Amino acid sequence: SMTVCQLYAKQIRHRGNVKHNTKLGRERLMRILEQDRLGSCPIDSVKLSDAKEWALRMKEKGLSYKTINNDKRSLKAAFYTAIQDDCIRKNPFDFQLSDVLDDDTEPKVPLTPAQEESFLSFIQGDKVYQKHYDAIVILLGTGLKISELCGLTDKDLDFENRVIIVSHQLLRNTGVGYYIDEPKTQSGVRKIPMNEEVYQAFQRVIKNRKGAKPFIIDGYANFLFLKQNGYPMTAVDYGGMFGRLVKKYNKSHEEALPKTTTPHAMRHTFCTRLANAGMNPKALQYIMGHSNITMTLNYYAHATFDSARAEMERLA
Amino acid sequence: SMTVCQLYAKQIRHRGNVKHNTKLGRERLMRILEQDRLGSCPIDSVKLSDAKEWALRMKEKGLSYKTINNDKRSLKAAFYTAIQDDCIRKNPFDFQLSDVLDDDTEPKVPLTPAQEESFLSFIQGDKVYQKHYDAIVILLGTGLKISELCGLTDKDLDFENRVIIVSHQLLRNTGVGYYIDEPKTQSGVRKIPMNEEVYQAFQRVIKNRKGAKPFIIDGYANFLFLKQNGYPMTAVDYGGMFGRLVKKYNKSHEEALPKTTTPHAMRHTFCTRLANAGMNPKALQYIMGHSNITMTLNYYAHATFDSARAEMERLA
DNA sequence: CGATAACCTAAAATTTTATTTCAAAATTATATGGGATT
DNA sequence: AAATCCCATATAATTTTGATAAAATTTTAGGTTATCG
């Protein structure tokens, strides 16, 4: 592995136990190297300046900051493997990316209650999207990621105790089609309770289910949420639906919805509400399914001296 | 850097920008290496099996779990330096200490409200330790570490706004005597409000100050808390004082106080109270001085499904 | 008169804290084309 | 009839997510002194 492409090729073959989406992503970076001048350099000649100039090119190509930072970390790990193989001494990607580029990531603004009520009223009223009203309510009332919602089946709901049992996701990719991913341990499994509006939503979704094709994958069947074609919804299908729905909303409402009103924005709103209401962080972390509690805590506003003093006075 | 001792000696010389307590700690580990068989081995002959046996000896010697794990981290860093200088291949200290030793660290259980009210009652009434009643109230009402308390001077209190300005600590060591450690960035400096009890206790500390000798160090003078000898209290002095206070308490009380009832215990109790009361986690992280929000979240009890459900029901 | 409480402190130990991604794996945007509704 | 949604999906992109010890605190041992047994 003397060329950078060959080195990355060696890295991903050595670390092959990955998911289908990971194989796609690696392919995307491999194409970047093949097109970029950096992929041709021998690894023993790649200097810290070459890696930085690579980033400037990626930004000039039009790739976002988060993309360029993620790919930098892939390359960094690749060169750390060539270091442990006695090919080079220093790792030319061991620099801070913010020193070279500015992070212009557009913040993801959650929905405000006023907007949320407005957004839902439009959905239930609209004759084309009202059929998705139930899914949106469930998203907003549970924090489910989109492929966890798609993976729900009759065996995952418990209406006696009003609990959602989140144990897997249903995914779909080109070629392979549908498949099920689930956690290796029992930590990714969580149980989310249903409030009155979520409980009533699942009831409507089960009563109105119609036209299900014969479908079973990795032992899972009888999914709650189906496309018109009789097969279950996928993340992409909801993404596309949200885009058209938001576009239709902004045409008739003066105040448009945030630019990034996607399915995850429902999870973001759900988490922001609970945090600002002062939910026990460890409890919120359970509902959300976060592994590191740092993830959950990013949803709590930074504290100030006056912030803290108020809290201490509030607690005698 | 052929023997392990010579290697460690190189790791500390190359990384010399350390505080006095670090120099003491490294010296302690150096003694262990010089007394242990492992100190004599050539680094190119230290196998993973060898490092594990070192830990067994340390535990056989009587060193606690955390000590051995801390020292293991030191040795590991030293071998990463040798691996980066092309002296060895793999790091023989890259293993989980859990697999060799069990962690018998006795948990530090904080004071229950009933204990605290009893502990303070005894101090106020005791003819010998009543003079320290004020320092202990402040410890319990502010969460100050012990060397931050010893560092408090008139210029650090603000009785108008009733705020403590923590910006430094006062330390003392054999030979060097006293010195002041401040944070590099203004992130370690924080401000703590005074409750009635605490503000009332600072007034007593200043009215009763007596017998101060001329003393200024790194620009700091007029310290609130002083030994009988006219110089300020140090961490050690409060430690020994706490040790005798607890002994005298456990003689006249049936239910003894926790084994680890030290000055830091007061910081522990303070933090546990606010966490259990449901204080904003990031507001508590500010008051405490924790640099990472993970350190503060350790004081919150893990959540259960029932714990989480009751919280979501509470936030209708 | 002795034992030991109370302070002080050198020496020796334990405990509290410190920067944290050596990319995977998901989600979303978009171009296209064939129906359905303007 | 021209134009615009609505769905579905391949393709391409963005976003979410999962200790490489220093520096403090505390314990203890030995001595003096003051207090108590």
Residue numbers in the entry:
A (entry chain B), B (entry chain A): 81 to 396
According to the publication:
To understand how Int can accommodate different CIs, we determined the structure of two additional Int82N-CI complexes. DNA sequences contained IRL and IRR sites connected by 6 bp homoduplex crossover regions of different sequence (CI6a and CI6b) (Lambertsen et al., 2018). The two Int82N-CI6 structures were solved at 2.7 Å resolution and show a similar architecture to the CI5 complex with two protein subunits binding one CI DNA. In both Int82N-CI6 complexes, the DNA assumes a similar conformation as in the CI5 complex. In the Int82N-CI6 complexes, one subunit is shifted with the CAT domains ∼2–3 Å further apart than in the Int82N-CI5 complex, reflecting small flexibility within the dimer. One difference is in the small loop after the β-hairpin, which shows an additional conformation in the CI6 structures located near the DNA crossover region. The maps at the crossover region in the CI6 structures are particularly poorly defined, suggesting that flexibility in this region helps accommodate CIs with different crossover lengths. Our two CI6 structures also show that different CI sequences can be accommodated in the center of the Int dimer similarly, again due to the distortions and flexibility of the crossover region.
The Tn1549 conjugative transposon propagates resistance to the antibiotic vancomycin used for severe drug-resistant infections. The DNA cleavage and joining reactions required for CTn transposition are carried out by a transposase enzyme called integrase (Int). Most known CTns, including the Tn916-like family, have Y-transposases that use a conserved tyrosine residue to attack a phosphorous atom in the DNA backbone. Int contains 3 functional domains: an arm-binding domain (AB), a core DNA binding domain (CB), and a catalytic domain (CAT).
